[PDB]
């Protein structure tokens, strides 16, 4: 920060709930805990300009966990192809996806 009075005195008024992997009230993990932890543990000691390209894989995995865009694309593609095939009459959905399965437990 501008005036690191917290680091001066060792207190944490606000710098302990800065992100997701940070002390949820009872120990319930937020989603992308692992991804954010890994990104942050890569980007430590480094600052900025070097972390933005030496810790890019981990940030990209985090971004896909949180915003989760490529899985939307993947399922949308699978669904679109399925609808095309069912319209053409090529695909035949099974019982365990039409609503008739043997429940496991």
Partner 1 sequence: MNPITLAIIYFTIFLGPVITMSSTNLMLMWVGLEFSLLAIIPMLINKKNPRSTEAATKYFVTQATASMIILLAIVLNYKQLGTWMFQQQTNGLILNMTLMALSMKLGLAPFHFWLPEVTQGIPLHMGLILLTWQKIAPLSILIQIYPLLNSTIILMLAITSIFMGAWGGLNQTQMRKIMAYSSIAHMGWMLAILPYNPSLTLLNLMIYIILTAPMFMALMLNNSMTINSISLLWNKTPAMLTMISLMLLSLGGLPPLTGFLPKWIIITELMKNNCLIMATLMAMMALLNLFFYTRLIYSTSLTMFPTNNNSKMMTHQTKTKPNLMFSTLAIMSTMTLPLAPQLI
Partner 2 sequence: ISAFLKNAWAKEPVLVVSFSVWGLAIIMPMISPYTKYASMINKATPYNYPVPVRDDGNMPDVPSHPQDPLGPSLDWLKNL
Partner 3 sequence: MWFEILPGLAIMGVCLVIPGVSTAYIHKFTNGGKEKRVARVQYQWYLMERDRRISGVNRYYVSKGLEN
- Closer to partner 1 by Cβ: residue 20 or 42: 20
Choose among partner 1, partner 2, partner 3, none what residue 55 binds, the Cβ cut-off being 5 to 8 Å by kind.
none
Cβ pair 32, 62 in contact under 8 A: yes
Structure tokens that stand for 49 in this block: 């300009």
- Closer to partner 3 by Cβ: residue 1 or 25: 25
CB of 25 to partner 2, least distance (A): 11
Burial of 62 (0-12, 13-18, 19+ CB in 10 A): buried
Q: Tokens 């915003």 correspond to what residue?
A: 67
Which residues in 14-33 contact partner 2 (CB under 8 A)?
A: 26-28
Residue ranges in contact with partner 2 by CB under 8 A: 26-28
């Amino acid at each position: 920060p501008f005036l690191d009075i917290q680091k001066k005195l060792g207190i944490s008024l606000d710098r302990h709930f800065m992100f997701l992997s940070a002390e949820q009230p009872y120990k319930n993990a937020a989603r992308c805990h692992a991804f954010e932890k890994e990104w942050i543990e890569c980007a430590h000691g480094i600052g900025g300009t070097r972390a933005k390209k030496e810790c890019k894989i981990e940030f990209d995995d985090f971004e896909e966990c949180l915003l989760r865009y490529k899985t939307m694309r993947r399922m949308h593609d699978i669904k679109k192809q399925r609808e095309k095939l069912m319209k053409e009459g090529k695909y035949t959905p099974p019982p365990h996806h039409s609503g008739r399965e043997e429940p496991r437990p």
